[PDB]
Design a binder for this molecule. Sequence first.
Ligand SMILES: CC(C)CCC[C@@H](C)[C@H]1CC[C@H]2[C@@H]3CC=C4C[C@@H](O)CC[C@]4(C)[C@H]3CC[C@]12C
Ligand SMILES: CC(C)CCC[C@@H](C)[C@H]1CC[C@H]2[C@@H]3CC=C4C[C@@H](O)CC[C@]4(C)[C@H]3CC[C@]12C
Ligand SMILES: CC(C)CCC[C@@H](C)[C@H]1CC[C@H]2[C@@H]3CC=C4C[C@@H](O)CC[C@]4(C)[C@H]3CC[C@]12C
Ligand SMILES: CC(C)CCC[C@@H](C)[C@H]1CC[C@H]2[C@@H]3CC=C4C[C@@H](O)CC[C@]4(C)[C@H]3CC[C@]12C
Ligand SMILES: CC(C)CCC[C@@H](C)[C@H]1CC[C@H]2[C@@H]3CC=C4C[C@@H](O)CC[C@]4(C)[C@H]3CC[C@]12C
Ligand SMILES: CC(C)CCC[C@@H](C)[C@H]1CC[C@H]2[C@@H]3CC=C4C[C@@H](O)CC[C@]4(C)[C@H]3CC[C@]12C
Ligand SMILES: CC(C)CCC[C@@H](C)[C@H]1CC[C@H]2[C@@H]3CC=C4C[C@@H](O)CC[C@]4(C)[C@H]3CC[C@]12C
Ligand SMILES: CC(C)CCC[C@@H](C)[C@H]1CC[C@H]2[C@@H]3CC=C4C[C@@H](O)CC[C@]4(C)[C@H]3CC[C@]12C
Ligand SMILES: *[C@@H]1O[C@H](CO)[C@@H](O)[C@H](O)[C@H]1NC(C)=O
Ligand SMILES: *[C@@H]1O[C@H](CO)[C@@H](O)[C@H](O)[C@H]1NC(C)=O
Ligand SMILES: *[C@@H]1O[C@H](CO)[C@@H](O)[C@H](O)[C@H]1NC(C)=O
Ligand SMILES: *[C@@H]1O[C@H](CO)[C@@H](O)[C@H](O)[C@H]1NC(C)=O
Lengths: 344, 344, 344, 344
Amino acid sequence: AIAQLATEYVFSDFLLKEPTEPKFKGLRLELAVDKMVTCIAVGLPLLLISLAFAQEISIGTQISCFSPSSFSWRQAAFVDSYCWAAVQQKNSLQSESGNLPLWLHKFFPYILLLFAILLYLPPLFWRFAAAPHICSDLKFIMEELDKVYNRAIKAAKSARDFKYPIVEQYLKTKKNSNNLIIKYISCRLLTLIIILLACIYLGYYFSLSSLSDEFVCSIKSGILRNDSTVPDQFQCKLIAVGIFQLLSVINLVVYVLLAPVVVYTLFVPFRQKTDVLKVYEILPTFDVLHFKSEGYNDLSLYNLFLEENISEVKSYKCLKVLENIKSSGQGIDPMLLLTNLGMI
Amino acid sequence: AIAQLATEYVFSDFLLKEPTEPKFKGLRLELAVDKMVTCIAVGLPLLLISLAFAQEISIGTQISCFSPSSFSWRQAAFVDSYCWAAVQQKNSLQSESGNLPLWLHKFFPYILLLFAILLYLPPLFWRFAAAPHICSDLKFIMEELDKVYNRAIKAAKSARDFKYPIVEQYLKTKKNSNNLIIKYISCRLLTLIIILLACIYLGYYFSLSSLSDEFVCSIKSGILRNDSTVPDQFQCKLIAVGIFQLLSVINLVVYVLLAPVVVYTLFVPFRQKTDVLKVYEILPTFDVLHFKSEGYNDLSLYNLFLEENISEVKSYKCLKVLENIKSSGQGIDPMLLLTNLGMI
Amino acid sequence: AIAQLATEYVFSDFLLKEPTEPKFKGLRLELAVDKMVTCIAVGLPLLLISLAFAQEISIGTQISCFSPSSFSWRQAAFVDSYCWAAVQQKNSLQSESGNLPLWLHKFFPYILLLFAILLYLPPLFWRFAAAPHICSDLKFIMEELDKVYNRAIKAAKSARDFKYPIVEQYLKTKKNSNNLIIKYISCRLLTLIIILLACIYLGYYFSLSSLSDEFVCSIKSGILRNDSTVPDQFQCKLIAVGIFQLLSVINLVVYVLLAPVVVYTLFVPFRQKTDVLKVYEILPTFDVLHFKSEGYNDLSLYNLFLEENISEVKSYKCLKVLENIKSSGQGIDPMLLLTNLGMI
Amino acid sequence: AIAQLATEYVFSDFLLKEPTEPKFKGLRLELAVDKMVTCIAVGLPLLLISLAFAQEISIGTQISCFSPSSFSWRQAAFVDSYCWAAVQQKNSLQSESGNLPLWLHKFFPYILLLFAILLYLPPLFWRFAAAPHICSDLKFIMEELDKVYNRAIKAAKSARDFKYPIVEQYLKTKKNSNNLIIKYISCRLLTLIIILLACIYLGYYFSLSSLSDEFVCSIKSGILRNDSTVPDQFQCKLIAVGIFQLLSVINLVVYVLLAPVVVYTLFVPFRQKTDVLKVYEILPTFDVLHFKSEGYNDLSLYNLFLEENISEVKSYKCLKVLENIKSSGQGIDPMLLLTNLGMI
Ligand SMILES: CC(C)CCC[C@@H](C)[C@H]1CC[C@H]2[C@@H]3CC=C4C[C@@H](O)CC[C@]4(C)[C@H]3CC[C@]12C
Ligand SMILES: CC(C)CCC[C@@H](C)[C@H]1CC[C@H]2[C@@H]3CC=C4C[C@@H](O)CC[C@]4(C)[C@H]3CC[C@]12C
Ligand SMILES: CC(C)CCC[C@@H](C)[C@H]1CC[C@H]2[C@@H]3CC=C4C[C@@H](O)CC[C@]4(C)[C@H]3CC[C@]12C
Ligand SMILES: CC(C)CCC[C@@H](C)[C@H]1CC[C@H]2[C@@H]3CC=C4C[C@@H](O)CC[C@]4(C)[C@H]3CC[C@]12C
Ligand SMILES: CC(C)CCC[C@@H](C)[C@H]1CC[C@H]2[C@@H]3CC=C4C[C@@H](O)CC[C@]4(C)[C@H]3CC[C@]12C
Ligand SMILES: CC(C)CCC[C@@H](C)[C@H]1CC[C@H]2[C@@H]3CC=C4C[C@@H](O)CC[C@]4(C)[C@H]3CC[C@]12C
Ligand SMILES: CC(C)CCC[C@@H](C)[C@H]1CC[C@H]2[C@@H]3CC=C4C[C@@H](O)CC[C@]4(C)[C@H]3CC[C@]12C
Ligand SMILES: CC(C)CCC[C@@H](C)[C@H]1CC[C@H]2[C@@H]3CC=C4C[C@@H](O)CC[C@]4(C)[C@H]3CC[C@]12C
Ligand SMILES: *[C@@H]1O[C@H](CO)[C@@H](O)[C@H](O)[C@H]1NC(C)=O
Ligand SMILES: *[C@@H]1O[C@H](CO)[C@@H](O)[C@H](O)[C@H]1NC(C)=O
Ligand SMILES: *[C@@H]1O[C@H](CO)[C@@H](O)[C@H](O)[C@H]1NC(C)=O
Ligand SMILES: *[C@@H]1O[C@H](CO)[C@@H](O)[C@H](O)[C@H]1NC(C)=O
């Protein structure tokens, strides 16, 4: 039913499932905006496919040819099925709009499924190629941040009663390499191109005259070519073409609204803001150097992933509340850190 | 069946599922009133869609055109399907009420699903954008309250046998920022606007003459335009239009009753009452300062979320019972706190 | 529905399920490229089979013979079923394209299923014959790497405050044996041959005239051979043949794009690059000798499997970050290793 | 659907499920070749049964008798059902090929299911009679091997810083008894005989003229015997007989390819090679005596089961890597064993 399709595709965790494995425990591995874009671009065409053939919106068979009254039920069924299979056969049918509109009307669900698959492909390539590496690197970075926070609080407590910046060096090294950012931009660009092509196709499909679904059909090949009792042609109409056009314009609207989001996603350096690591600069055990901005490198992408999935880090949360309290400046950062006692 | 739909949509945890993740363990992340509003506004139109096409209420096909007796079954089926697809084609049909009523009668389930999706969108935006931040902040606040309660009871026990207000400073800082409250008000306002538009549409749909479902249909395009055996027109009726109007007025009543709730929700400062933190003011380790009221800021929203999901805090429950006992004044707050022995 | 099939076969973990057993905990046991190739080559033909007979794309029965009007419904049904069963019987039918096109049109789903099974066979043979051995060997290798890393860090810590290369000897011994690599190459080659044969078949099927689906059928055997009221022949058409050809060309395109991937897979020594063990050469407890390259031996395959599933090793990750930091050369490898404190 | 059947029967763990009980944790209890043979021989005929009546390959009803035009739909249905039930009644029908072909055409699914059940019976008898005993014995043997390995490594460590061969005596005793091997050979031989009988039946079924499915049917018993309006006979055809023959030849090919595998399985002593226990002979605590070869006794079968499910033993894996390293001979077996430190 329509409501069942809605529950499956919008109100359920459709493509929102976290990786089912212990390797990525709590790691999104995909930005929220990218996940939203993929979920829409994939589950919208599927939802429209399901809707267009819902038991309520669908009168019945997808084509009716209006055989003569003399024709029996199965003769008329032969006519309808023959014309359905003959939309491909150009000789059989003669339609003013041509045969491409008939092909599109017959295979619209296939085309929507193709667009959905093509849009799901780049996210899958990301999740299967560049996701494990970033997951491992980000897990190491979070562990290092937790360890340095613990060491700093222990030092502060000892004072009240190595020291090498490994994480900073690793981030600096990531500043050079750009394979991950190149893959990310390539997959986003392919998604954008697929969306644009889908928009072109949907606009063309919705621009039809709405009468191209009606085509003339001739079961006059073979032994029936010279038969007399059979009329030279029939009036066939492809039902649900109006529904297809409505859903196609809906998908076109959604995709044109979505494309600016993908373009904004492509410009990762601009998105790289609100320095996540700036909060850690007040730790004595952490060097006061952010050095993450203004670069078409994997460093900006790692900064984005950190700003996305750093809320799960207790040390980061503690430092964030310390920073927020520092806005008033009533107290002292080391005193607040010592009082917090948030090692684990 | 009707009962199955009821069990799925009203008697089950439809959209009442808690976040399936360890990050939010026991945190609602959504006020009870907001959750009720979203659940109604989403699962009502879906329930009505399912009901309108239930196997019992539905006689059968959604349109019947009453072809002549001479017409065969599949000729009549062609007529019915053609008219179903031609509700869009204005030239084919001539109805007194126009063609918009026919469009609405055909696509009412789609319109209800659209309203449900549009009403579910703002809650989803909230849960995916502003929910993680408030979850982390509120978890930190609850942990700080538990820790300060433990410290105060330990101090009392030591007396019988830092001290910095970090949580108060954090709340004071939240008094300034307003991004969360702005997002909350924006999503509530969008929900209200969607509800009002849905009410307008449902009132228009229910105000129809009830005879607009009957339209005249002409299969007279193409080779059949000059055919003689076919009548110039047919009498088609869109079945289930009365059911659609009944369910639409039901949804209109529900939404007009719900809109005052959304308006009341918009005025969060008025809702900010029954100070949750007032109970903690009797703790020696906690400063006697509430400072949370009369502000279009995130502080009021945090106060609401606390008053919502603070019952899970054992220290808060203990302080609440101490406060309630203090109404009589027979005993002493520190003595009762020491006797409680409710560290964990 | 079409969307359900898509969810099952592309958006779900179809053939992507990890081995359901404690023996292989986190071990892929199959390279990512090989898994992708198998998943495509298997779940594409199945998806096309499901699509070709979807409730929306399918008009109805797969063959209609257009019995005379005098014929009753069940007489026409007998004609259709007889011709469906007589596509095999060459005498009954006379078609210009022959009888092989009719066989193919009738049994296309069977042929796609056969290709899917034949393509799934070599992966299954691998997973049931050569997977347990490589799993055990690789688990031992990872355990040895973890143990040597722990010993090296313990030695470094002791200095700050046996020694036999068992793993290196085992890898060197693997350099000689080649049964695993021979099995891998044989299964890949069989997969490639099956893909090529499938491409040949699909090209032949798509090269048909598109009118071979229309064949002449004669129910004139037995008592009906000399019957007069029955016409000497009927015009039968195999519906969905156009859909079969469309999906067959789609599968042909996918398989021709996939075959280069399989050919590249066959050349494992070229794939053996980015020495995984090179990072471990900086450990005092590990001998400085890689000795893994330029060989049609199981050593290259083991190197590939290591480069695939070594990210799960904490010691390997730590050594990798040490290597990446060494690019700048600011610090010292032993000092960084001591500071890391990543025993477990 | 066809793809669903494929997923259930070839791509899923059909009859590949490990024993669902804690008694056999990780013990196959069935050789890989035997499991493959059983899985094929059982799930192939079931798959063919499901395929032959798939919603796509099946035109409709399994028999059509071509009643006269004067006959009504339910008169024709009576004719078809009567002939379907009268394939057994020899007097009613007169077919050139006889009545056995009609029996076979009607009950082919039953015959395939019978063959599948008969082939599944011997494996079930094994798993319910001789599997628990071998499971217990093999678990004891693995535990003894682990214990002796632990004792030997402990002795080596003590030197660096009872002694009775219970397992060897148990294996020697198993050398005498042969009940398990006799049961194994009997079940394999019964499986082979069932496969041969199935091949005979399938060859006979596929050797039919392909026109035996067409039989003459006479509804002329009872009050209708002397009725005039009813024709003396009808032309009935059993649909799907061609599909049955195709699938039967497929099953015949599979079974003839499989029978050599079963014959090779029967010769267990030849399969008994690559002495698993030879690796343990280098342990000081283990006597240097294999004494397992060249015997129609349970010892060879136990050797096969060990070679199958010994990879799960850490001590065996360690000894195997020690053996492989000994190929070069660079080091010493006791030194390598001491350095390994693989007690558990
Ligand atoms: C997804 C991508 C590939 C879709 C590409 C656009 C498709 C949907 C449409 C939009 C405009 C279309 C073209 C418009 C006009 C003509 C001229 C005609 O004489 C032949 C077909 C041809 C050349 C059409 C082919 C298909 C076409 C290119
Ligand atoms: C992503 C955005 C830009 C998509 C907007 C849809 C655009 C591309 C659509 C809307 C209307 C469409 C046009 C409608 C009609 C025709 C006439 C036909 O003979 C050739 C294609 C052509 C000229 C179409 C080309 C594509 C088109 C311009
Ligand atoms: C969800 C929102 C967009 C719904 C908006 C209201 C819809 C349901 C209805 C209510 C009143 C309607 C209008 C009433 C009268 C007319 C005048 C007529 O000559 C053209 C249509 C037009 C202009 C209608 C368009 C659709 C309309 C605006
Ligand atoms: C949220 C609350 C206010 C909704 C209450 C429903 C109201 C808005 C409904 C109920 C009856 C409706 C009217 C019924 C009939 C017509 C005549 C038509 O030619 C134009 C629209 C118009 C004038 C409708 C406008 C909307 C309407 C006034
Ligand atoms: C999967 C593998 C086995 C498929 C092999 C190719 C199949 C699909 C096709 C492609 C070309 C075909 C051949 C083309 C021409 C002829 C000549 C004709 O007089 C008899 C059939 C015969 C000999 C065909 C047999 C089937 C054939 C070989
Ligand atoms: C893997 C790649 C190479 C596959 C590409 C498809 C090729 C092999 C296909 C496409 C068109 C096909 C041809 C189409 C028509 C005929 C005529 C027929 O009488 C014999 C087979 C023959 C000659 C086919 C042989 C195979 C063929 C050449
Ligand atoms: C599974 C086992 C039992 C199958 C045994 C073979 C079956 C399928 C077939 C193969 C050959 C067949 C026989 C061939 C010829 C005749 C002679 C005829 O006048 C009576 C039936 C009889 C005697 C057939 C009986 C059934 C038969 C034995
Ligand atoms: C396991 C292997 C050997 C099976 C190979 C199938 C063999 C046994 C099949 C293939 C063709 C079959 C023959 C086909 C036709 C007839 C004629 C009939 O009047 C008696 C049975 C008889 C003589 C069949 C006996 C069995 C048969 C020889
Ligand atoms: C049909 O009859 C015409 C008469 O002109 C003839 O040309 C044609 O070949 C016939 N077709 C068939 C299929 O017999
Ligand atoms: C139908 O016949 C009329 C007669 O006036 C003619 O004008 C019209 O073009 C014909 N239509 C078709 C589709 O042939
Ligand atoms: C049909 O009648 C013809 C007349 O020539 C005869 O040859 C043939 O044998 C008959 N067929 C049957 C099945 O009785
Ligand atoms: C049918 O009529 C015949 C006439 O010869 C007679 O012999 C036979 O008994 C009748 N059968 C029945 C069932 O009445």
